[PDB]
Amino acid sequence: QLNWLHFLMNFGNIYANDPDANFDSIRVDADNVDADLLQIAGDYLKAAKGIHKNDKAANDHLSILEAWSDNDTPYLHDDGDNMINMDNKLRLSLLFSLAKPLNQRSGMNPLITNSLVNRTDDNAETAAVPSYSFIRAHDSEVQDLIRDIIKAEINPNVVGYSFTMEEIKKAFEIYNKDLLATEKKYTHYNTALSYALLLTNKSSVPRVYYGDMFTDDGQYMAHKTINYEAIETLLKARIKYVSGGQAMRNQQVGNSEIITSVRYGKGALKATDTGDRTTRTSGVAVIEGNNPSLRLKASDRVVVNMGAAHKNQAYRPLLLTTDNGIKAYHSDQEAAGLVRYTNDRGELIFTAADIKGYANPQVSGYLGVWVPVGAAADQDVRVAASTAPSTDGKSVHQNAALDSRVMFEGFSNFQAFATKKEEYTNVVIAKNVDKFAEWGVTDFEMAPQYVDGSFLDSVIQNGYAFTDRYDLGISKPNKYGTADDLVKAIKALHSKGIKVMADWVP
Ligand SMILES: [Mg+2]
């Protein structure tokens, strides 16, 4: 229903008499999506928000399709890029090359080529097709893993997803211990390696999942994951360093392989571009392996071309793999003891002294990330959207301005129920908006707000009549707080210029 969409996009106007309390954008939350409905949703955004006119209008109302497939990408593209779809091939490359157990783990080449964008050499001012990229989401796998854990370790007779509260309790004890284990029976390997690629890739809007920075269970933002520090470090570095063209390479070395991923720096689309002073102190190198047994030969070298702005230059680590986890460096001074140089050609050179396989709770393989020395404390290589008219018939354009955005899926289906007002998700969001701004979050994907411990979207969406979808914590609190708490959260995100995405189930 399009009149329910109209209500959601005017919730601030209708409930609060306050346009600053309106949602900015739409998550089209499908089973199957009819192409006709995608066209009508696009028509709403063009008529109401003028997204066809220029990138500033489009990027202030950036809307997505969630249909668990790539299938609608051609139709969305042909209909004028009025919303962006997921890059499902890249998600599957991250899952199989990095996250899977060793006996199912793919070679690393798909991380480069098995995507909407072949990132071997991505030098485009504007990518052909816009997208968002992610590794996990609220319904990507946890419900399945909790079922697997209960079936294997607690109750082998369980039918479907019909669990007792005590079964889910016990299953999360096992799940949470597995997150902290080197040898993982259930949970994903190499989360930080997946985020290092997601947050340095060109030509996609990355979406960070709440449950990769905080525990999937327990109170909102109460318990940081072991990967919180690595992911926060990458998010802050993305603002400061991540710009320009991309090169990805895949080298056989010793008994295994590595990939390299380079961004040339702001104002350098090609490896030959020299750019300006800001190009010199931006860009990044990511080095990854997915094999804990990786050992380089004494003669093995990994030569990493940083681009023509980076000849004869000091580099320092951002993230390095250690025996026990990942060390983060928060300044040039903190990394002073590990400075290395590019040569006359702008190449970093790594050896067995730098790269080997590790097995720890965060890494199954290898991660190293390097940034140029000398960035100002306030350096920000993001760019604002153009107000010049769009001239190709498309609304959303995957250019440097869209690449500057970060989406945050700001909920877990398995969050604990608040025991006091201070624990309500929407109260906590309002209190912590400075943190989302620090991370470069531009688009905040909120939980469904209408009026329950269900963790299956199927059960939730079946459990509420069409009138229930107008009750956004109004008749009684939703799981996330009162309607007034929702209004305050939307206004708080707007106070930092962060856009807020409504969950629209057609
Ligand atoms: Mg969905």
Residue numbers in the entry: 233 to 262, 264 to 684, 688 to 742
Q: Which lines from the publication concern this structure?
A:
Initially, GtfB-CD, like GtfD-CD, underwent proteolysis during crystallization setups at room temperature, which we only identified after the structures had been resolved since the gels after purification appeared to be satisfactory.
All three enzymes belong to glycoside hydrolase family 70 (GH70), which cleaves the glycosidic bond between the glucose and fructose moieties in sucrose during catalysis. While fructose is released, the enzymatically produced glucose molecules are sequentially fused into a growing glucan chain and, depending on whether a 1,3- or 1,6-linkage is formed, the resultant product is either an insoluble or a soluble glucan, respectively.
